[PDB]
Write an enzyme that holds these catalytic residues in place. Structure first.
Site, PDB file in Angstrom:
ATOM      1  N   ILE A  37       0.645  -1.270   0.023  1.00 27.38           N
ATOM      2  CA  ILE A  37       0.698  -0.023  -0.461  1.00 27.38           C
ATOM      3  C   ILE A  37       0.611   1.526   0.241  1.00 27.38           C
ATOM      4  O   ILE A  37       0.363   2.294  -0.704  1.00 27.38           O
ATOM      5  CB  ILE A  37      -0.962   0.172   1.531  1.00 27.38           C
ATOM      6  CG1 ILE A  37      -1.516  -0.961   1.265  1.00 27.38           C
ATOM      7  CG2 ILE A  37      -1.721   1.801   0.866  1.00 27.38           C
ATOM      8  CD1 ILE A  37      -2.528  -1.726  -0.145  1.00 27.38           C
ATOM      9  N   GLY A  43      11.390   0.802   4.358  1.00 26.78           N
ATOM     10  CA  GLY A  43      10.224  -0.189   4.546  1.00 26.78           C
ATOM     11  C   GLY A  43       9.000  -0.109   3.670  1.00 26.78           C
ATOM     12  O   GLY A  43       9.046   0.391   2.110  1.00 26.78           O
ATOM     13  N   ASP A 156       6.513  16.154  10.864  1.00 27.26           N
ATOM     14  CA  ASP A 156       7.392  15.867   9.578  1.00 27.26           C
ATOM     15  C   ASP A 156       5.046  16.811   8.750  1.00 27.26           C
ATOM     16  O   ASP A 156       5.050  14.706   8.181  1.00 27.26           O
ATOM     17  CB  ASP A 156       7.651  14.221   8.821  1.00 27.26           C
ATOM     18  CG  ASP A 156       7.587  14.565   7.123  1.00 27.26           C
ATOM     19  OD1 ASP A 156       7.568  15.325   7.042  1.00 27.26           O
ATOM     20  OD2 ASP A 156       7.714  13.398   6.954  1.00 27.26           O
TER      21      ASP A 156
HETATM   22  N1  LIG Z   1      -2.858   3.104   9.325  1.00 25.21           N
HETATM   23  C1  LIG Z   1      -2.427   3.058   8.040  1.00 25.21           C
HETATM   24  N2  LIG Z   1      -3.771   2.317   6.788  1.00 25.21           N
HETATM   25  C2  LIG Z   1      -4.524   3.029   5.840  1.00 25.21           C
HETATM   26  N3  LIG Z   1      -2.260   3.039   5.031  1.00 25.21           N
HETATM   27  C3  LIG Z   1      -0.997   4.372   5.941  1.00 25.21           C
HETATM   28  C4  LIG Z   1      -1.579   3.687   7.320  1.00 25.21           C
HETATM   29  N4  LIG Z   1      -0.282   3.987   7.638  1.00 25.21           N
HETATM   30  C5  LIG Z   1       0.646   4.538   6.353  1.00 25.21           C
HETATM   31  N5  LIG Z   1      -0.580   4.118   4.992  1.00 25.21           N
HETATM   32  C6  LIG Z   1      -0.168   4.740   4.057  1.00 25.21           C
HETATM   33  O1  LIG Z   1       1.431   4.615   3.686  1.00 25.21           O
HETATM   34  C7  LIG Z   1       2.146   5.861   3.115  1.00 25.21           C
HETATM   35  C8  LIG Z   1       3.229   5.930   3.722  1.00 25.21           C
HETATM   36  O2  LIG Z   1       3.617   5.174   5.743  1.00 25.21           O
HETATM   37  P1  LIG Z   1       3.958   7.024   6.602  1.00 25.21           P
HETATM   38  O3  LIG Z   1       4.217   6.020   7.727  1.00 25.21           O
HETATM   39  O4  LIG Z   1       2.843   7.248   7.140  1.00 25.21           O
HETATM   40  O5  LIG Z   1       5.573   7.456   6.288  1.00 25.21           O
HETATM   41  P2  LIG Z   1       6.329   6.613   5.549  1.00 25.21           P
HETATM   42  O6  LIG Z   1       5.967   6.324   3.874  1.00 25.21           O
HETATM   43  O7  LIG Z   1       7.478   6.875   5.707  1.00 25.21           O
HETATM   44  O8  LIG Z   1       6.314   4.716   6.063  1.00 25.21           O
HETATM   45  C9  LIG Z   1       1.278   7.119   3.560  1.00 25.21           C
HETATM   46  O9  LIG Z   1       0.930   8.200   3.331  1.00 25.21           O
HETATM   47  C10 LIG Z   1      -0.459   5.796   3.568  1.00 25.21           C
HETATM   48  O10 LIG Z   1      -0.548   6.762   1.809  1.00 25.21           O
HETATM   49 MG   LIG Z   2       4.803  10.322   5.115  1.00 27.46          MG
END
Ligand SMILES: Nc1ncnc2c1ncn2[C@@H]1O[C@H](COP(=O)(O)OP(=O)(O)O)[C@@H](O)[C@H]1O
Ligand SMILES: [Mg+2]
Ligand SMILES: [Cl-]
Ligand SMILES: [Cl-]
Ligand SMILES: [Cl-]
Ligand SMILES: [Cl-]
Ligand SMILES: [Cl-]
Ligand SMILES: [Cl-]
Ligand SMILES: [Cl-]
Lengths: 359, 35
Positions: A37, A43, A156
């Protein structure tokens, strides 16, 4: 990590995981139907289906490094708020290569982000309806009021890190991978936060900044929601400051002193500001512009606090007892403030909590 | 970031570039309206 096939033939992953909140007692957690997703340099984010409850979850898989310095798990275990994504479980796992250790954050699944919905409207040459701008910004400021009360600065704030359920209009702040509990007198790295949303004192190299960098970022998000694109599209760190100065004008000596006192003596060229009413489209609501002008201040202590922002008159329609979502269903939870949430300005509850919700 | 003396020079130089672009922009308006 063991694997099984159930009825319907899906691949089942079974792990032992620790609950995000409550007592430290590991439990078997089984999920299936995993798909990618989201993405990062360190990661992957997955959607999965919990086997016992059938609920959709998100799993954020983050590579572990000794020099990484990630406070994300520690912060997520501490947070419990309706506008922050909840940590259900966490567990460690190993990848296909040697010594490849991953932290796995099982989160509540939310189907959309503010960035994707805003981009969708922007691609259709349309602006998000103002009621959603109020709802999204209000819930964001609410979540910032919560984390800031613990001293925790997100660092952020951007539309991609704002999860969104379009059916309910619920917003949930996510991605605590840059978040830190700021301690007075202990310096913080100034190269932080995504470029378009980065506060000017960070670009000036201040290491003694506060949680008000999040309020600048929220201002950038609000401006982007009104404009349809980022308001400050810098090509680089210095260019980002130039893009800010092109709109707001050159900061005064006193504003420079408040951002970084090492720059007070420099005579910078005086760039004429764009008037706030010319920054946005003609029919942009004037209270949205006004609220934005109180977030995008050079002087960090002059920016509204998140609780003050929630009390701004731009959100009055949310406090109207007749307010409902355009689809017909009523607004999400907006006035169930906790003592922790209101701790910055406890008297403000008489404004934040209208009489109809006090009941 | 970096040395403030170095960063301030780079910022000043870029802001002077903004002034020159804006001034050239208005001169171009005058040239176009003269045509
Ligand atoms: N709890 C969640 N439920 C659904 N989608 C998520 C969730 N957490 C993150 N995502 C999706 O994955 C992307 C990346 O996760 P995030 O932790 O926000 O940033 P990063 O890319 O630095 O890990 C987010 O922008 C969101 O689109
Ligand atoms: Mg992010
Ligand atoms: Cl991103
Ligand atoms: Cl402190
Ligand atoms: Cl002085
Ligand atoms: Cl000048
Ligand atoms: Cl300003
Ligand atoms: Cl150089
Ligand atoms: Cl023209």
């Amino acid at each position: 990590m063991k694997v099984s096939r159930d009825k319907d033939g899906s691949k089942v992953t079974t792990v032992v995981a620790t609950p995000g909140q409550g007592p430290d007692r590991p439990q078997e957690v089984s999920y299936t139907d995993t798909k990618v997703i989201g993405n990062g340099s360190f990661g992957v984010v997955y959607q999965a289906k919990l086997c016992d409850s059938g609920e959709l979850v998100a799993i954020k898989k983050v590579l572990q490094d000794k020099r990484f310095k990630n406070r994300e798990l520690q912060i997520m275990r501490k947070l419990d708020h309706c506008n922050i994504v909840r940590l259900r479980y966490f567990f460690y796992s190993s990848g296909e290569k040697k010594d490849e250790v991953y932290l796995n954050l099982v989160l509540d699944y939310v189907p959309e982000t503010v960035y994707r919905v805003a981009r969708h409207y922007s691609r259709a040459k349309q602006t998000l309806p103002v009621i959603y701008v109020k709802l999204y910004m209000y819930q964001l400021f609410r979540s910032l009021a919560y984390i800031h009360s613990f001293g925790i600065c997100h660092r952020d704030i951007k539309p991609q890190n704002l999860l969104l359920d379009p059916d309910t209009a619920v917003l949930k702040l996510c991605d605590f991978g840059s978040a830190k509990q700021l301690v007075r007198g202990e310096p913080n790295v100034s190269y932080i936060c995504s470029r378009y949303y980065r506060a000017p004192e960070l670009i000036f190299g201040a290491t003694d900044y506060t949680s008000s960098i999040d309020v600048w970022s929220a201002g950038c998000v609000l401006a982007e929601l009104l404009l349809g694109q980022p308001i400050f599209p810098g090509d680089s760190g210095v260019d980002q400051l130039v893009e800010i100065i092109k709109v707001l004008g050159t900061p005064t000596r006193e504003q420079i002193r408040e951002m970084n006192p090492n720059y007070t003596e420099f005579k910078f060229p005086q760039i004429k500001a764009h008037p706030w009413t010319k920054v946005f489209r003609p029919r942009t609501p004037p209270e949205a512009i006004a609220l934005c002008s109180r977030l995008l201040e050079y002087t960090p202590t002059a920016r509204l606090t998140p609780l003050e922002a929630c009390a701004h008159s731009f959100f009055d329609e949310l406090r109207d007892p007749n307010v409902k979502l355009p689809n017909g269903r009523d607004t999400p939870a907006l006035f169930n403030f906790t003592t922790q949430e209101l701790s910055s300005n406890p008297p403000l509850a008489t404004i934040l909590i209208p009489p109809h919700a006090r009941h | 970031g970096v040395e403030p003396q170095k960063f301030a020079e780079e910022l000043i130089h870029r802001l002077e570039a903004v002034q020159r672009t804006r001034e050239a922009e208005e001169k171009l308006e005058e040239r176009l309206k003269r045509v």
